[PDB]
Amino acid sequence: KTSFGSLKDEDRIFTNLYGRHDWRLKGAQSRGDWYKTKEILLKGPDWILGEVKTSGLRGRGGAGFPTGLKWSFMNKPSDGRPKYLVVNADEGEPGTCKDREIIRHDPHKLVEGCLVGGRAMGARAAYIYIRGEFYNEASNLQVAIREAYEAGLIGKNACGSGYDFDVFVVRGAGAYICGEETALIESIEGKQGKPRLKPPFPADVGVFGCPTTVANVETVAVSPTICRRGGAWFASFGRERNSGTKLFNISGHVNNPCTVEEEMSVPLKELIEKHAGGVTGGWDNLLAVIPGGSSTPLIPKSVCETVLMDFDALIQAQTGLGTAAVIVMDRSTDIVKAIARLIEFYKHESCGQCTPCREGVDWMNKVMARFVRGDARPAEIDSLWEISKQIEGHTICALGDGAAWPVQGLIRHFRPELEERMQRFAQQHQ
Amino acid sequence: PFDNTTYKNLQHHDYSTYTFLDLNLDLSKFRMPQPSSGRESPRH
Amino acid sequence: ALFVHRDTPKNNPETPFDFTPENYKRIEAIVKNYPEGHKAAAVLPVLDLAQRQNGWLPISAMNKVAEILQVPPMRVYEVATFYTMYNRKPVGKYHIQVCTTTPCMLRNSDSILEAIQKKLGIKVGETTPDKLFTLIEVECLGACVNAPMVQINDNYYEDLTPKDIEEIIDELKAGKIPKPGPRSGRFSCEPAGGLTSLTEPPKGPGFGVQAGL
Amino acid sequence: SNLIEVFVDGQSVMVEPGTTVLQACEKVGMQIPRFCYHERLSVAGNCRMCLVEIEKAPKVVAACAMPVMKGWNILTNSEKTKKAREGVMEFLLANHPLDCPICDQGGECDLQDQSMMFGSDRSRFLEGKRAVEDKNIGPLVKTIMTRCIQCTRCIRFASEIAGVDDLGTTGRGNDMQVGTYIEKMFMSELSGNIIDICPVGALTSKPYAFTARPWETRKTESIDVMDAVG
Ligand SMILES: NC(=O)C1=CN([C@@H]2O[C@H](COP(=O)(O)OP(=O)(O)OC[C@H]3O[C@@H](n4cnc5c(N)ncnc54)[C@H](O)[C@@H]3O)[C@@H](O)[C@H]2O)C=CC1
Ligand SMILES: Cc1cc2nc3c(=O)[nH]c(=O)nc-3n(C[C@H](O)[C@H](O)[C@H](O)COP(=O)(O)O)c2cc1C
Ligand code: SF4
Ligand code: SF4
Ligand code: SF4
Ligand code: FES
Ligand code: FES
Ligand SMILES: [K+]
Numbered sequence: 001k002t003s004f005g006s007l008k009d010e011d012r013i014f015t016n017l018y019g020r021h022d023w024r025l026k027g028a029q030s031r032g033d034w035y036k037t038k039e040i041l042l043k044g045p046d047w048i049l050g051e052v053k054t055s056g057l058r059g060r061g062g063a064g065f066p067t068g069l070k071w072s073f074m075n076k077p078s079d080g081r082p083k084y085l086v087v088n089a090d091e092g093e094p095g096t097c098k099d100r101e102i103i104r105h106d107p108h109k110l111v112e113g114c115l116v117g118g119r120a121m122g123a124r125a126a127y128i129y130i131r132g133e134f135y136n137e138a139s140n141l142q143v144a145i146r147e148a149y150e151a152g153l154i155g156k157n158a159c160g161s162g163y164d165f166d167v168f169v170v171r172g173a174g175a176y177i178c179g180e181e182t183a184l185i186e187s188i189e190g191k192q193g194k195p196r197l198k199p200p201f202p203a204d205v206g207v208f209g210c211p212t213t214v215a216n217v218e219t220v221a222v223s224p225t226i227c228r229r230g231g232a233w234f235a236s237f238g239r240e241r242n243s244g245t246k247l248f249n250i251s252g253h254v255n256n257p258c259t260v261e262e263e264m265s266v267p268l269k270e271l272i273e274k275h276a277g278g279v280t281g282g283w284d285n286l287l288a289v290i291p292g293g294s295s296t297p298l299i300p301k302s303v304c305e306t307v308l309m310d311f312d313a314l315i316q317a318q319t320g321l322g323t324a325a326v327i328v329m330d331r332s333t334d335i336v337k338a339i340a341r342l343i344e345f346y347k348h349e350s351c352g353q354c355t356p357c358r359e360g361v362d363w364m365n366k367v368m369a370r371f372v373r374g375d376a377r378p379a380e381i382d383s384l385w386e387i388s389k390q391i392e393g394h395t396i397c398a399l400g401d402g403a404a405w406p407v408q409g410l411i412r413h414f415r416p417e418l419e420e421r422m423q424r425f426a427q428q429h430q
Numbered sequence: 431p432f433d434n435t436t437y438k439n440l441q442h443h444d445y446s447t448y449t450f451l452d453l454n455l456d457l458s459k460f461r462m463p464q465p466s467s468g469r470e471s472p473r474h
Numbered sequence: 475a476l477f478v479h480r481d482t483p484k485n486n487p488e489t490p491f492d493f494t495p496e497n498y499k500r501i502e503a504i505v506k507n508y509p510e511g512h513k514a515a516a517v518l519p520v521l522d523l524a525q526r527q528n529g530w531l532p533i534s535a536m537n538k539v540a541e542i543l544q545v546p547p548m549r550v551y552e553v554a555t556f557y558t559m560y561n562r563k564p565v566g567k568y569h570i571q572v573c574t575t576t577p578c579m580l581r582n583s584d585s586i587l588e589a590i591q592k593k594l595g596i597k598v599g600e601t602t603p604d605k606l607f608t609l610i611e612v613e614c615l616g617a618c619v620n621a622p623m624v625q626i627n628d629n630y631y632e633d634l635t636p637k638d639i640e641e642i643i644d645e646l647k648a649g650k651i652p653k654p655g656p657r658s659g660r661f662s663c664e665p666a667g668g669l670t671s672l673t674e675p676p677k678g679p680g681f682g683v684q685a686g687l
Numbered sequence: 688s689n690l691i692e693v694f695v696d697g698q699s700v701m702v703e704p705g706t707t708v709l710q711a712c713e714k715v716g717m718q719i720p721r722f723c724y725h726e727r728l729s730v731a732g733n734c735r736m737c738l739v740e741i742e743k744a745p746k747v748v749a750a751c752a753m754p755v756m757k758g759w760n761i762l763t764n765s766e767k768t769k770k771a772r773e774g775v776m777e778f779l780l781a782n783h784p785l786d787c788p789i790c791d792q793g794g795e796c797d798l799q800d801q802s803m804m805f806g807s808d809r810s811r812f813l814e815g816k817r818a819v820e821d822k823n824i825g826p827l828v829k830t831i832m833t834r835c836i837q838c839t840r841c842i843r844f845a846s847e848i849a850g851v852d853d854l855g856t857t858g859r860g861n862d863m864q865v866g867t868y869i870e871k872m873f874m875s876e877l878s879g880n881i882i883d884i885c886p887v888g889a890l891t892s893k894p895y896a897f898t899a900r901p902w903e904t905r906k907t908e909s910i911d912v913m914d915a916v917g
Contacts, residue, residue, distance in 0.1 A: 007671075009673065010674070018663060018669070020661075020672075032676070036683070082509075094575045096616075100617075101663055104442075104662070131616065142453045143441075149460045170518070170519070174558045176613060176614075190514040190515040190516065190545075208515075233682065251580070256665035259663040275665065275670045277665055294575075327618075341579060345576070350859070351556075352859055352860045354734075356778050359782060362861045380813075393746055394771055396732070396735075434675075443654055451497075454503055464508065464509040466509070466510040467510060471514070477858035477863070549852075551869075555859075556857075
């Protein structure tokens with residue numbers, strides 16, 4: 001197979017993504033959920049982990065780590081401590097709203113995924129870290145959790161298999177840095193959302209010191225479908241080591257911003273011209289595209305023509321996949337102002353525990369504000385690049401790298417616009 | 431039949447301030463006994 | 475805008491505050507949600523519970539939450555100051571947050587912000603003199619495909635126009651409660667030009683399963 | 688024998704399991720620069736000054752928090768280690784206030800000493816620095832919070848050895864201040880020892896403040912007689 005995309009409705013993972021059907025237990029069980037879960041729980045954690053590993057499912061959070069190996073990290077005998085599975089439902093990344101749609105429209109799929117994942121790694125219970133701002137989503141999730149509890153699917157003797165499994169929902173308090181898995185673990189324990197250092201990994205010391213595995217909503221809710229349809233069914237899509245279907249949130253200067261499921265290795269041009277309704281003012285009006293939300297560098301029109309929206313093609317285009325969040329900027333935009341606002345957002349969401357991010361993000365904010373104003377010298381632009389090289393790779397967590405990447409991409413792709421802006425200011429003001 | 435032109439998430443308009451908390455209070459009766467570390471706090 | 479506290483007559487440890495017995499039962503359930511030996515893990519929602527008791531957090535819910543969980547008060551102070559949801563200043567009855575992040579400013583959220591400013595007659599971060607509306611700006615709230623948007627109390631209002639937000643304001647002033655949903659043609663996240671996907675009905679259970687399961 | 692052999696600068700040494708990089712580097716008689724690590728306090732790993740490079744590994748690890756493994760070779764004088772040290776020093780000195788003549792830590796300051804030893808020689812920060820509101824935490828420890836570097840030895844000392852649990856880190860981002868969030872008078876039997884563990888002049892001795900300078904002081908060792916601990 002060479003042409004990737006044009007996914008039929010028979011292969012979409014998340015039916016009722018648009019909320020047109022019932023989201024409760026009677027609606028979810030009529031769409032295929034909660035079917036033959038007892039045999040899945042009874043077959044074996046080794047079989048479930050092997051089926052996940054053969055499927056080639058990778059990280060849907062944006063890190064790109066393979067899910068099967070990471071889930072099999074905790075497949076070890078216990079030392080007397082309980083084991084925990086935690087679902088990351090914070091989703092503080094700009095441009096990203098797919099997990100909100102999953103927790104608002106398919107909560108029972110998330111609960112069945114929690115049960116299947118907890119069976120796979122022998123977890124004692126499940127914790128869902130919902131976002132604080134998603135109050136209605138959390139209420140709907142807890143309604144579905146109660147409806148699944150009163151049906152005997154979870155709890156004591158879950159799904160009639162003799163395996164106990166408990167589920168919890170914990171609300172956040174408005175912090176994007178709580179989306180990091182170690183900062184999420186620290187936030188559940190009742191401290192500030194300040195990340196830990198690896199090693200020790202969460203598979204050894206996690207929440208409450210117990211072995212704990214943290215996984216995204218989109219990589220948990222697909223696990224019962226992974227077990228039911230089979231590994232090769234998910235491996236049929238995309239390129240090699242890029243299998244699966246992805247939710248894409250397209251927003252920006254676009255006629256119809258929307259969330260849509262598609263194949264992994266679909267070209268970006270086909271997706272943005274088919275599902276998004278096209279760039280405003282035609283294709284020639286397009287100026288830049290950020291393919292993964294605020295964590296990834298942008299790419300101009302010269303790279304956006306024949307780019308495949310998977311991990312390998314995007315990492316070959318000196319950017320990252322991110323959370324498949326397509327932010328589109330046309331020619332009627334102040335691009336430097338947009339990157340300055342992104343950097344100011346990164347300044348307003350940074351825990352401040354470790355020094356290089358805590359100082360360099362503020363320094364980058366001042367430099368980019370002066371660049372938007374234009375009050376600098378041109379060589380300082382190159383100096384700003386060096387500041388990024390003093391942040392990327394010297395931080396506790398990846399928020400500093402996630403702030404250094406868009407500045408590097410903006411400089412590397414639109415240095416002429418920056419320098420012409422500031423020399424125009426220098427001419428017209430001095 | 432089949433309906434595809436109506437939004438079914440109409441319950442979220444009728445949520446009060448304490449719906450999450452009272453839902454947790456009602457759901458607390460279905461939960462397993464929590465494990466014990468041997469002490470009531472690490473500061474003990 | 476200050477991360478340190480000074481003793482005022484309206485904000486001091488001697489300010490009276492207490493939990494209702496139903497809220498005590500809710501706090502007990504929240505504590506029982508966590509493993510034994512880790513009572514401090516209940517400090518995150520319970521303090522937020524106190525916010526739902528008052529609308530803002532003086533330093534009397536801080537000490538009370540520290541007392542009823544056997545934690546030092548400085549941990550509660552750290553938790554309240556680190557997180558932006560916990561209002562340590564008395565906000566208005568309807569807290570309005572406007573998203574000014576790049577996928578929201580791309581769809582001209584500045585016009586909506588200026589419409590709110592010229593309607594309520596306030597500034598950024600200022601409180602209306604009838605103690606009803608508070609207007610601040612925050613980061614991305616997860617409604618990027620329905621940008622621009624606002625968040626009033628615990629209700630999302632997405633795909634807004636200046637006419638839409640001024641209608642929301644003058645209907646909120648009348649005592650009624652608006653509809654927490656997008657105000658455009660689409661309902662939640664579908665494209666406005668019809669369903670580009672999931673036009674076919676779902677296929678139900680027992681579809682595409684493998685042998686041996 | 689459970690002890691494993693590691694390599695520093697091409698030289699073999701025999702260390703115990705669970706031993707960090709910095710302990711092995713001290714075992715071979717070298718001192719990796721540090722701000723937040725302490726041999727009597729818990730590991731925080733946030734100052735990021737102790738970053739070194741393991742060979743055949745394209746990411747610098749924190750020597751104060753990374754356990755060693757068998758066969759590792761540690762390069763403590765390579766190019767990227769010096770680049771990381773200079774970058775961390777520049778970030779630390781970006782918001783530090785120009786208070787060296789009027790600060791009691793001058794002449795015995797860790798920040799000045801390792802800035803001379805491992806940092807650069809000029810500042811590229813052309814913007815305006817931050818300013819932190821001062822605090823009053825007692826009649827013994829003079830407090831000027833503008834000079835702090837958020838090393839969090841205050842916090843670990845107050846929570847682990849003194850066990851008073853009064854100090855904390857309020858706020859988020861670069862505006863986070865190390866304080867008590869209220870006018871709390873931190874008084875204990877071991878308060879003044881924080882003046883020992885502050886690497887900067889943020890905390891100073893109030894009776895000793897603006898009285899002398901460490902380079903003109905003769906040191907004479909003696910025994911305490913006020914208490915019977917000796
Ligand atoms: N999904 C979202 O909303 C957002 C996602 N991101 C993305 O998240 C990523 C950063 O997060 P991380 O989880 O730190 O990424 P990655 O470096 O850590 O690691 C992915 C997973 O593998 C594990 N792991 C890493 N190194 C390991 C090792 N040597 N041995 C064993 N396990 C190991 C981690 O614990 C984690 O569970 C970036 O790619 C960033 O773009 C960033 C912002 C928001
Ligand atoms: C600063 C930061 C914020 C993050 N926020 C989220 C988030 O909100 N949601 C999420 O699923 N992952 C987030 N992540 C990624 C997680 O660290 C981790 O990759 C994810 O929770 C699970 O990855 P997985 O898809 O392989 O299971 C964030 C990472 C960083 C560095
Ligand atoms: S990189 Fe920034 S957000 Fe991440 S741990 Fe360091 S200070 Fe915190
Ligand atoms: S603490 Fe700061 S002001 Fe004092 S001597 Fe050191 S660098 Fe100078
Ligand atoms: S005042 Fe000194 S000891 Fe305390 S956190 Fe700051 S630098 Fe560290
Ligand atoms: S950028 Fe505004 S809701 Fe995400
Ligand atoms: S000494 Fe290791 S990070 Fe500070
Ligand atoms: K000192």
